[PDB]
Amino acid sequence: MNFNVGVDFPSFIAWDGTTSFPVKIDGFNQFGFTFKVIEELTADVPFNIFYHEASEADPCVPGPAIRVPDVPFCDGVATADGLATVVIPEAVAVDSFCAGSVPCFNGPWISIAPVTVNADSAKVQVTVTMKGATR
Amino acid sequence: MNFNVGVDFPSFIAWDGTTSFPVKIDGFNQFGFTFKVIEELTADVPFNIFYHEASEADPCVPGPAIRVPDVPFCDGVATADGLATVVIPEAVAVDSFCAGSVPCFNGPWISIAPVTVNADSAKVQVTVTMKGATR
């Protein structure tokens, strides 16, 4: 039997290959990204993770982007600058996907965008999924 | 705590606003659509739901598009012509999303596209969410 999974685990676009979209995570209590590759890559593509806060002019519109800080785990060492980053390796096949998520929440808005906008960046897609809702 | 949902419930883009992308539902056992608006509409926008078979010349590539048939529910009636369809009403605000799914699987690939490619259809975004895998 098939289910209406979208009722419980909605999905929102975050990076369609040409533009980024802030995603509101305030109503939910978990989330995670999902990367897909549509063409053969030419070099490693790094990604930056940002978070926003409610604007003063409107309490339902994101403000400017604030870069997410790092959070070292019990094993391993902190990043060179203590800021989160994501790197898609060269070996990713066109018919596979990746998954990763941040350890901490921070503000109620999140976003993701590549470090550099080039032809290699246009070959990637990023999407965000939500866990159970709180309202 | 944050759970990294993307491992268990991957989500894929289906209609970014200017192009339709086939999604391979074969590897999973449930799925569902999710609709979101980015700008106000002017009239109801209908969507067509297809399924694709494996390509004859290459088993790893999707074949031609085939319209999904309707299955009457336990207590209702079939559509005008027995084919599944969806309509996004006018009352939908920008800060809202809609979810729905088909009752039967059919082919291994699925797809969705608007009936028309006018300016209204470009304001909607669609993605597909998958439930636990089987491989």
Binding site: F35, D70, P72, G76, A78, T79, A84, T85, V86, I88, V92, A93, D95, S96, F97, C98, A99, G100, S101, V102 | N4, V7, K24, D26, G27, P59, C60, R135
Partner: peptide, 27 residues
Amino acid sequence: MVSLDCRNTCAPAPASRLVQPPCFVCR
């Protein structure tokens, strides 16, 4: 710092890597 998890592929092998068998030993 984030650790990515990736599946081998959506299909086990979209183009199955069917390979020749080892050549037969000498006479």
